[PDB]
Design a protein around this ligand. Structure first.
Ligand SMILES: [Zn+2]
Ligand SMILES: [Zn+2]
Ligand SMILES: [Zn+2]
Ligand SMILES: [Zn+2]
Ligand SMILES: [Zn+2]
Lengths: 69, 42, 56, 98, 111, 56, 147, 308, 45
């Protein structure tokens, strides 16, 4: 749903690069591979972690909250 | 003569509800099944 | 003494009279004294023979 | 140490299926019996037992374990004591055991 | 716990002799005569005497004893009743056999 | 067989009634009572027999 | 990994490989048997309820329902319901004048456990009150799971 | 007045009476909680049919129908023979009455509980000396009204008459007789609560407002107005139907919903003159017939109520 | 009395055993029980 905190294979921290990856794709008009390389993800285990992630939390946030406060 | 008793809506309502709730297509089997929601492709 | 919650352990104790005692709810009176000819239903331990099957 | 052979290594798409061992594991030493046949109840959700079918009986017959077959069919399942008359084989003997 | 001790000798079934009940044997074996098509009395508290679930035929409850043997559900084997039919009726499983015997014997002297 | 099976016994005059164990009364929530199919058929037999007796 | 088996990385499992949420739903209704008998959601007590389950009723509230977010384990009762009984019926003794209700509660599955997620109370087409309770659990890969 | 035939489970070793007993369903055992001794083992937990011993009592019967192979002659003859039963004739009348009650309730779109209660009331009140000269239509209508009231979905006399063709005199007499019978059996052998009251005008307001298509806010305001309307002696004596209708009309004009009294009375079968007359009485106490929270929030004030 | 929340307008209500299951504000017939206010412990594994 949300970006994983750690890479499954090796344990590198990748949960702090989702916003940077999206910003590189949108504002900088960079390709996915170039953005992944620029973010410091060298091993394809982390490259797939960030490349194949699907952000379903954005869709889940479209529903009105069940409980208010 | 009372039309409310001459026409019984339960005939249509119960017939359709039964035929859809169960697979018995009367009053063939397995015409209606519970939709699979295990996954989107399913 | 180990009882039914620790392997190896026991679950029931059967006296020579045929009556069965559940070790659960029995610790209130303490450990039971065993006598010859009684039966202790104890957990299957290592090297116990068991029949292993696969259908059909 | 390096493996003598080289390993095919790469990403692959894998799926987790609905079958989990924790949802199938079940064992029974004793439990409830059905009202009709007074045999172990069916269904792992109700602490039911496993079926010792005709094929299992045939395999045990081939093995020659007559005592094991009898124990499975009697001690591990329904076992009932009835009183029969010597004149008529009918089990219509009223027994005031007390 | 197990079943209560019995003084009768313990034996093993060696032969099984099949046969058909005679009406006299049915009446003798029966412990009660069922003449009411109901199961419970007007109060729905206890089984009606002479009904289908007559207490003399046994018990299928863990809380009631059998009025015949005074034993629990796990010891009572069950006791048979009987219904005296108004007229004789054929046995559905023996109609063909009865027909063959009728064609084989005379229908006026039985020879 | 003269002793165990005569042709006259293939015709039923006295119908044995099995005990409740053969036809137990099941319960779903224990607040609703269910009766066995054998019990239903035996009740039908009794009603028909009483009707025939009263008629004849 | 012989005969169609596999070896999985325990570190990857710890980091969240092939982990899943399991939601299970239980439904219960207040049935009205005639004008005399009716069932109600309640927290049965040991002094007024007969044949109540051996589980623990500490988690129930005054309405006979567990609030969401509470943890439940095997044999725990999640929906507590009671129905009246007719007199002149004694079972295994233990039936005194104090007892006037009997339990009809819905217990959690013996082998399942988790945290109650969402409980909703409403009325069906017939106007009888019925409730739906959902329980969450986490399934982590094991040495028996299928992939 | 009969044999005991009762089994009581007690621990011989403990001797405590009453005993603490635990039913281990999973292990199929009944165990003493103090010493752990097992008292009874091998305890028990489609082949049968279910029945309700409250509407049918004890009556076991089976139908005859076609199978995978059957001849119509045998089915017809067997059904004919089964029909000519004297013992079963008595209960067939009750079964037919149940069938007609079911048809009426189903055509009325009433919940299952309503028709079940109606059948129970009919069975309880049937076969008595008091109800011997009254029409089955009146009996069924009275039973349906009693069931509707017992189910907290009480309907009105005119609403039930719209389906069952029975005049008011017979309907009321039968209803009173049935209520007396129910009270007598409740005492000798509960039955009634606050719902058994006659007026209960609060229950009608939601359905009338639904018929008129008003919003739930207007429905709640009308409920409050009707609840407070009983404090005026000049209106408390009026029929509950009129009280509810007048309250609904007052709230309709309070919220300025474009529905005229000519249509309100036409939809709820109430005279427009009666509606306006009741509005005249309630206008003198409009101040006590409006929700303080509503008037404070300002959705509407007392002003939006024309007075003649 | 116990606290519930409407399933549509998300209003907190205080319901008793006698009160009907219904939202007094909008009229919705579905209510979700309010989350328990007692802390629940979770392991970070
Ligand atoms: Zn990595
Ligand atoms: Zn004999
Ligand atoms: Zn007996
Ligand atoms: Zn004891
Ligand atoms: Zn709401």
């Amino acid at each position: 749903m949300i970006v994983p905190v750690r890479c499954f294979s090796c344990g590198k921290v990748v949960g702090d690069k989702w916003e940077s990856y999206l910003n590189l794709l949108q504002e900088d008009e960079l390709d996915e591979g170039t953005a992944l390389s620029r973010l410091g993800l060298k091993r394809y285990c982390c490259r797939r972690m960030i490349l194949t992630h699907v952000d379903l939390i954005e869709k889940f946030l479209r529903y009105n909250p069940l409980e208010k406060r | 003569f009372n039309m409310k008793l001459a026409i019984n809506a339960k005939t249509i309502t119960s017939g359709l509800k039964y035929a859809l709730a169960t697979g018995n297509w009367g009053e063939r089997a397995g015409v209606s099944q519970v939709l699979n929601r295990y996954t989107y492709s399913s | 003494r180990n009882g039914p919650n620790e392997h190896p352990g026991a679950k029931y104790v059967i006296r020579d009279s045929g009556d069965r005692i559940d070790l659960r709810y029995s610790k209130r009176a303490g450990d039971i004294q065993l006598q010859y000819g009684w039966k202790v239903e104890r957990h299957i331990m290592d090297n116990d023979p068991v029949l292993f099957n696969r259908q059909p | 140490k390096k493996l003598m052979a080289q390993i095919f290594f790469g990403p692959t798409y894998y799926q987790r299926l609905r079958h989990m061992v924790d949802d199938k594991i079940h064992a029974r030493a004793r439990g409830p019996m059905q009202v009709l046949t007074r045999q172990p109840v069916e269904g792992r959700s109700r602490d039911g037992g496993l079926r010792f079918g005709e094929m299992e009986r045939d395999c045990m017959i081939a093995h020659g374990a007559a005592s094991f077959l009898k124990e499975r069919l009697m001690e591990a399942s329904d076992a009932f004591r009835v009183h029969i008359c010597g004149i008529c084989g009918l089990m219509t003997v009223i027994a005031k055991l007390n | 716990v197990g079943q209560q001790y019995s003084s009768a000798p313990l034996r093993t079934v060696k032969e099984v002799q099949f046969g058909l009940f005679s009406p006299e044997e049915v009446r003798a074996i029966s412990v009660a005569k069922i003449r009411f098509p109901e199961t419970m009395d007007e109060t729905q508290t206890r089984a009606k005497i002479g009904g289908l679930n007559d207490p003399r035929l046994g018990s299928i409850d863990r809380n009631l004893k059998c009025q015949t043997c005074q034993e629990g559900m796990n010891e009572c084997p069950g006791h048979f009743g009987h219904i005296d039919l108004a007229k004789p009726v054929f046995h559905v499983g023996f109609i063909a056999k009865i027909k063959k015997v009728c064609e084989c014997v005379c229908m006026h002297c039985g020879k | 067989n003269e002793v165990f099976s005569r042709p006259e016994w293939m015709i039923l005059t006295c119908l044995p009634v099995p005990p409740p164990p053969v036809r137990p009364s099941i319960s779903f929530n224990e607040s609703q009572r269910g009766e066995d199919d054998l019990t239903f058929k035996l009740a039908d037999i009794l009603k028909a027999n009483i009707s025939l007796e009263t008629l004849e | 990994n012989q005969e169609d088996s596999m070896i999985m990385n325990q570190s990857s499992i710890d980091r969240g490989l092939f982990r899943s949420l399991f939601f299970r739903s239980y439904m219960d209704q207040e049935k009205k048997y005639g004008m005399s008998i009716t069932e109600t959601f309640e927290k049965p007590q040991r002094t007024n309820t007969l044949r109540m389950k051996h589980g623990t009723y500490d988690k129930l509230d005054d309405d006979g329902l567990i609030a969401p977010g509470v943890r439940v384990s095997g044999e725990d009762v999640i929906i507590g319901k009671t129905t009246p009984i007719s007199p002149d019926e004694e079972e295994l003794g233990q039936r005194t004048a104090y007892h006037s209700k009997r339990d009809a509660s819905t217990p959690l599955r013996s082998t399942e456990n988790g945290i109650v997620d969402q409980v909703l109370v409403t009325t069906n087409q017939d106007g009888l009150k019925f409730v739906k309770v959902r329980v969450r659990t986490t399934k982590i890969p094991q040495i028996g799971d299928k992939f | 007045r009969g044999p005991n035939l009762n089994i009581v489970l007690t621990c011989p070793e403990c001797k405590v009476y009453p005993p603490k007993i635990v039913e281990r369903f999973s292990e199929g055992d009944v165990v003493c909680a103090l010493c752990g001794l097992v008292l009874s083992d091998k305890l028990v937990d489609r082949v049968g049919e279910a029945s309700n011993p409250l509407l049918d009592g004890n009556n076991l019967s089976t139908r005859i129908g076609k199978g995978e192979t059957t001849d119509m002659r045998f089915t017809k003859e067997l059904n004919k023979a089964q029909g000519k039963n004297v013992m079963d004739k008595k209960d067939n009348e009750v079964q037919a009455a149940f069938a007609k009650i079911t048809m009426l309730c189903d055509a009325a779109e009433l919940p299952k509980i309503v028709k079940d209660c109606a059948k129970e009331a009919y069975k309880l009140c049937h076969d008595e000396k008091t109800l011997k000269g009254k029409s089955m239509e009146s009996i069924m209508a009275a039973s349906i009204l009693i069931g509707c009231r017992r189910a907290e979905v009480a309907r009105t006399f005119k609403e039930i008459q719209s389906l069952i063709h029975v005049k008011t005199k017979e309907f009321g007499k039968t209803l009173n007789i049935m209520k007396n019978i129910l009270r007598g059996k409740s005492e000798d052998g509960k039955i009634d609560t606050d719902n058994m009251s006659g007026a209960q005008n609060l229950t009608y307001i939601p359905r009338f407002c639904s018929h008129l298509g008003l919003p739930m806010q207007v429905t709640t305001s009308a409920e409050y107005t009707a609840k407070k309307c009983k404090e005026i002696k000049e209106i408390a004596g009026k029929s509950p139907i009129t009280i509810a209708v007048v309250s609904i009309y007052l709230n309709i004009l309070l919220f300025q919903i474009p529905i005229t009294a000519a249509k309100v009375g036409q939809t709820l079968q109430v005279t427009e003159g009666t509606i306006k007359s009741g509005y005249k009485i309630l206008y003198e106490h409009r101040d006590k017939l409006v929700d303080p929270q509503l008037i404070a929030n300002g959705v509407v004030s007392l002003d939006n109520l024309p007075g003649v | 009395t116990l606290k519930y929340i409407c399933a549509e307008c998300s209003s907190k209500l205080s319901l008793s055993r006698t009160d009907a299951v219904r939202c007094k504000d909008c009229g919705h017939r579905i209510l979700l029980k309010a989350r328990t206010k007692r802390l629940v412990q979770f392991e970070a594994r």
